[PDB]
Amino acid sequence: TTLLNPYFGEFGGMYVPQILMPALNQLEEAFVSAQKDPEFQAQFADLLKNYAGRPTALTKCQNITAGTRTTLYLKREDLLHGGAHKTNQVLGQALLAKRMGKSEIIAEVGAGNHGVASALASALLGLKCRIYMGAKDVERQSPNVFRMRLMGAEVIPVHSGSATLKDACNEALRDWSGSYETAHYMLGTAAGPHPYPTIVREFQRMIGEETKAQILDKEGRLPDAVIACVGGGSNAIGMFADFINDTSVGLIGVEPGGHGIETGEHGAPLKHGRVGIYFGMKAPMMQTADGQIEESYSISAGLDFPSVGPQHAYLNSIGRADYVSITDDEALEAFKTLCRHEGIIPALESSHALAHALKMMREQPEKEQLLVVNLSGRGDKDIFTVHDILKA
Amino acid sequence: TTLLNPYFGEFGGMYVPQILMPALNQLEEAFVSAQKDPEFQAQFADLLKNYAGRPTALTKCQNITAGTRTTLYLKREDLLHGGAHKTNQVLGQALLAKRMGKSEIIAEVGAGNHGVASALASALLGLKCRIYMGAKDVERQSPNVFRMRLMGAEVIPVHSGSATLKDACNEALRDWSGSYETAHYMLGTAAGPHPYPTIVREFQRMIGEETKAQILDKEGRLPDAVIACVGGGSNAIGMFADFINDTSVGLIGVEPGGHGIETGEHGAPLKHGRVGIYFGMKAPMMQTADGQIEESYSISAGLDFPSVGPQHAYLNSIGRADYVSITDDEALEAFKTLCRHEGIIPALESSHALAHALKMMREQPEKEQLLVVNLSGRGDKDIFTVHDILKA
Amino acid sequence: MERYENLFAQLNDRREGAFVPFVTLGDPGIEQSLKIIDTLIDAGADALELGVPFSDPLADGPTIQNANLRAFAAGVTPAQCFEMLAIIREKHPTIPIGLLMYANLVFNNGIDAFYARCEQVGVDSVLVADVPVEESAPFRQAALRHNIAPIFICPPNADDDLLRQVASYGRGYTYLLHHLIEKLKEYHAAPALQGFGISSPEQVSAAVRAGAAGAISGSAIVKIIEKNLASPKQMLAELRSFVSAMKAASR
Amino acid sequence: MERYENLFAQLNDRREGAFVPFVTLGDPGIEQSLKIIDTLIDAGADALELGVPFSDPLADGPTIQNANLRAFAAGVTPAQCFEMLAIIREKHPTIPIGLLMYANLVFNNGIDAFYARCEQVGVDSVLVADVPVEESAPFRQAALRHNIAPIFICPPNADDDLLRQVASYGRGYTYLLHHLIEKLKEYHAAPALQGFGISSPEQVSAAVRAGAAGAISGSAIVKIIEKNLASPKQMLAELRSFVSAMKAASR
Numbered sequence A, B: 001t002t003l004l005n006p007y008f009g010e011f012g013g014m015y016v017p018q019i020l021m022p023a024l025n026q027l028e029e030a031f032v033s034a035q036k037d038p039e040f041q042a043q044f045a046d047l048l049k050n051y052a053g054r055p056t057a058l059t060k061c062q063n064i065t066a067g068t069r070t071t072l073y074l075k076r077e078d079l080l081h082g083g084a085h086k087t088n089q090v091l092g093q094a095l096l097a098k099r100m101g102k103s104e105i106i107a108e109v110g111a112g113n114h115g116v117a118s119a120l121a122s123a124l125l126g127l128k129c130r131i132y133m134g135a136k137d138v139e140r141q142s143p144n145v146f147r148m149r150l151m152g153a154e155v156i157p158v159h160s161g162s163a164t165l166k167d168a169c170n171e172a173l174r175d176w177s178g179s180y181e182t183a184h185y186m187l188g189t190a191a192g193p194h195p196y197p198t199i200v201r202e203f204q205r206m207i208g209e210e211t212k213a214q215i216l217d218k219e220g221r222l223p224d225a226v227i228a229c230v231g232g233g234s235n236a237i238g239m240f241a242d243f244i245n246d247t248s249v250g251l252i253g254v255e256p257g258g259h260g261i262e263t264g265e266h267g268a269p270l271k272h273g274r275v276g277i278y279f280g281m282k283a284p285m286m287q288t289a290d291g292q293i294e295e296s297y298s299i300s301a302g303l304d305f306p307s308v309g310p311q312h313a314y315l316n317s318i319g320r321a322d323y324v325s326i327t328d329d330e331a332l333e334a335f336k337t338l339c340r341h342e343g344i345i346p347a348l349e350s351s352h353a354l355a356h357a358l359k360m361m362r363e364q365p366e367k368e369q370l371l372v373v374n375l376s377g378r379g380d381k382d383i384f385t386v387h388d389i390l391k392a
Numbered sequence C, D: 001m002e003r004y005e006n007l008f009a010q011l012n013d014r015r016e017g018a019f020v021p022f023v024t025l026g027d028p029g030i031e032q033s034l035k036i037i038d039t040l041i042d043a044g045a046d047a048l049e050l051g052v053p054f055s056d057p058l059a060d061g062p063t064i065q066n067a068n069l070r071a072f073a074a075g076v077t078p079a080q081c082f083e084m085l086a087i088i089r090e091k092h093p094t095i096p097i098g099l100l101m102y103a104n105l106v107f108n109n110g111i112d113a114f115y116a117r118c119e120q121v122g123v124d125s126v127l128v129a130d131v132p133v134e135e136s137a138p139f140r141q142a143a144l145r146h147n148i149a150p151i152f153i154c155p156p157n158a159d160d161d162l163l164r165q166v167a168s169y170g171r172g173y174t175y176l177l178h179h180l181i182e183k184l185k186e187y188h189a190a191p192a193l194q195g196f197g198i199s200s201p202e203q204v205s206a207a208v209r210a211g212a213a214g215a216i217s218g219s220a221i222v223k224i225i226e227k228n229l230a231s232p233k234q235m236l237a238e239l240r241s242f243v244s245a246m247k248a249a250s251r
């Protein structure tokens, strides 16, 4: 029994061992209560404004669209404290943890930036944070490991199994199954078991809400389409949410095409995967013919999630949102284009969304269209990656 | 003859070869005109708001001051597009360049971030940017060189002389002496020949103006003191400016003490230098007994300027502003403290200002005081520096 | 079939508790695994709980995580696991065989088809690790249509509503992790087997004395395999020794 | 003294232009530099413009930037430069000697003290590279009090107000970089010497033909030094050859 619907069509659910159900039910209840509590909302808004830097700007990109009938705006989540949209919801979840009387945070990460995000929110709110990560990942993520440790987080290397992300996740959940009374598991995307897909969306929806107000102020109407990259689905659902009931507004999700869909080396499970049950949810995923979960691939680590949030799978099924893919090379070109023409270095993740908007413009340059790309993060972190590639 | 006073007491002036005077006079005139032009102001405000992300937040730091009678706020310039306050004035100068009908920007840099700032503003406004830097600096600044080139700037390595910053600066000014009709020299701090000290201050004063409004909104009164690090003087004068006539507000400038004033290895010319004439201005500077200009030292490259802005020297002489110094170790401790207690990674430059506020609090924990530290930039760029040090 | 019902009836007539060991199919290899299983049976295991290697076993612990690693390194697949299951049943007609699965491997090619395959090879029960009673409808329905017992875990943090659901939905046996045992019996739940930390003879006697119908050793067997990887002969010897001692404790 | 006035009067009586070479004091070394200067004089230089190595010569170009490098590498200091200046004057009583300085080296220990030192060693003029006429008051005042000629550069982009200031403030000679020459003469400016790109005999004759009183070779001499660093003897030979040719072009 739950307070909210755990499913979006056939997608979603709570596929976790029985022992974790009480933790999920407790979290769902706290969330429902918090959403109706003006004090929680005011506190959350105060942190977003005075600590994180909300609202973020909506930048018009005249240089990029010159000569076409496309008008392009970029939602600047790259200017959010931390450099990415992830900050919004980790602060929200940290506040939920405190609401439940908890003083500890559990998280896991590989090459992602979720560890840094969880650590900074925990430092600000006085929470003891422990982050699990495969031993192999520790050895390759010295920079982020240091950032997390500087912020007082305890980084716990996992040697069991293949010593990779999946082993860290397993350890984190095992930990949580026995310590949920005093610790909160901070999930980093709009996926996993209910209530996380719903909570993450709600704690990221200010992205879409601000965009709506900003576009109406500047253009006097809604966008013809909002475009966002999709790894797990949080920055995209955050942008999409407030626009779902605005039928005239297109919702375009961009999955990583990697080396190309036909190569099998991509991260586009929503459009090229197969429905399965994994990480506590029923959703499209990268899997072998006999059901083993496969790894996604993308030049961008942030979009390297073998599945996708259930609400996206649902929005796609009913035709409300459309999903496409962008290759490594297409994302690299968009990255270079934004740097040279707007003086903004975008995250390679965000570059996938920009790459698709660029395609919509270039393919039909005389088509009048007002577009908004969600620039989910800054790309300082990708300079080395891009440099080496261009090098060779 | 000039429109504005080139001096602040005995400090300042226009000590440049005769051939550069017309360029300075032209710039001063354009500036005076632009300052009275509502359209220029509106255009400048639009860029600061919708592109750079102004206004920046004013964050209260409860965790750091717990148990004391100090209330501390941080002006978040670290959240500005680009990661530092430098963005504010380069955008302003780029607009001045366009006002004068110019389409080219000239700059020079060593280990600083002024090159990246000049390059991003030039890319946004369609200006051809060329940045000079000593060959030796090019070899050690691969990351920034790449950032500038990604943003379309032409990075010109200088091999003449000692192939260092001073040679780049010389080449840049020589270049400008012959091309000022079509190119604008973008000076990166509140120093050099008039009108730069005045222009940079005016294009950075929104820092202090926003802080005043934000502190009045949150505390209902002005700060007992505003604290900012001083390398060249721009972020500090930007914070100070709007507070100069508020006699009750202390203005504290923090110069780098390096390994310690007594070691001779520091960057505190204002308080431990000697008045001289260099870089087009009369001001306190690091110099040998017979007049050769010495190098400053600091764990933070950004504060490595052998002199200081003339207005600071003046504010100090009349006792309106007070200047102190903070050592490498004191700045490192502040850096660690902010990371662990507030979840904010500060630039090592900004850490000097925070270190002094921490001292004011700790030395007299029962003294009631409302302080504002100007967090001039983020410290992602310093993670390696700090990591290696702590390592050893 | 009614293998569990027949087993417990026989154990009851002997005032005996059941001892059930768990092992991962194919660990450390197909051949050595078949030998391991025959040894567990000869040594006295009353029933078997067998796992099928899965890429992301979010539930299991390090011992099991490493067991799957070894199995995958040997190229073990679900198809080969079912081949092993058929062979095991052909050799042992009455011992109850239970599988410990992860939802995706059951859902993958169709839930009904999976339980039909189980019935075909002679499996008796299936515990899906990541399917709580709340999401179990299609799984238990398919299990029952194919004469397979759907098994559920009764956790420490279980409440009264959960006890009733588990009592109502489960068959074969209740996987337990004194009052709980009484309440389960009160609700006519399948016989309860204690599965928490069963690694010594005294824990087996304690479980039965507490009212449980037996005990499940969830990882003690795997640890013995992990420890004797260098000597297969010694591995089987120690497994026979352990199981024999654990089973003796149930009489 | 009146060395410049006496020189130009003598050149005029001979319908001759002045040829002034520039070199950095101490480049490439104190001893070799003294020899270089004596060679320039013997070869026919009518006057000398001598630079004092400064750490940050924001004006000068690469040739000069490298000249200072060589001088500093030899440990040359302003104090040693003044020692050289005294020696040079003791050997050559009438040739005008002009210094090319940077503001800090003049301001450092007191502007007045600097010009007093110049007067003491026998210097005749000082051109401060980074002091425009607008900031020149204390410098020209101190120069005049010590019988030193303050010299100013008349740039290409010069306007009428600047011409008048330079004509009024300068002494010795006007450092020029046809109408300009006429206007300067009109305002009674010190005799003008063309200093822009003077590196060949034809440029010297052209300057004089244009109305200038002579020409200053701002870097051609330094280039010759830079090119013959390996052979001091050959360096002096080429310097004598160049200066002799340049001076011949002024007659």
Ligand SMILES: *Cc1c(COP(=O)(O)O)cnc(C)c1O
Binding pocket: A083, A084, A085, A086, A112, A113, A188, A189, A190, A229, A230, A231, A232, A233, A234, A235, A236, A302, A303, A347, A349, A350, A376, A377, A378
């Ligand atoms: C983490 C990240 C993403 C991917 O996560 P979603 O949950 O799919 O939004 C995208 N962009 C940036 C900059 C990120 O840091």
Ligand SMILES: *Cc1c(COP(=O)(O)O)cnc(C)c1O
Binding pocket: B083, B084, B085, B086, B112, B113, B188, B189, B190, B229, B230, B231, B232, B233, B234, B235, B236, B302, B303, B347, B349, B350, B376, B377, B378
């Ligand atoms: C450039 C920089 C400074 C130093 O420059 P000022 O002109 O002295 O302000 C200080 N802090 C940061 C973060 C900088 O980037």
Ligand code: NA
Binding pocket: A230, A231, A232, A267, A268, A269, A296, A303, A304, A305, A306, A307, A308
């Ligand atoms: Na994905």
Ligand code: NA
Binding pocket: B230, B231, B232, B267, B268, B269, B296, B303, B304, B305, B306, B307, B308
């Ligand atoms: Na300085």
